Amino acid sequence: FLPKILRKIVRAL
């Protein structure tokens, strides 16, 4: 996975 796509998930979560 990537940091950009991963981080986005964290924020939303």
Cα separations in angstroms, 11 against 1, 2, 3, 4, 7: 16, 14, 12, 11, 6
Report the alpha-carbon distance of residue 3 to residue 7 in Å, rounded.
6
Whose tokens are 């924020």? That residue is 11
Cα separations in angstroms, 12 against 1, 8: 17, 6
Q: Which residues of 1-12 are buried (b: 16+ CB within 10 A; e: fewer)?
A: eeeeeeeeeeee
In eight-state DSSP terms, residue 10 is H
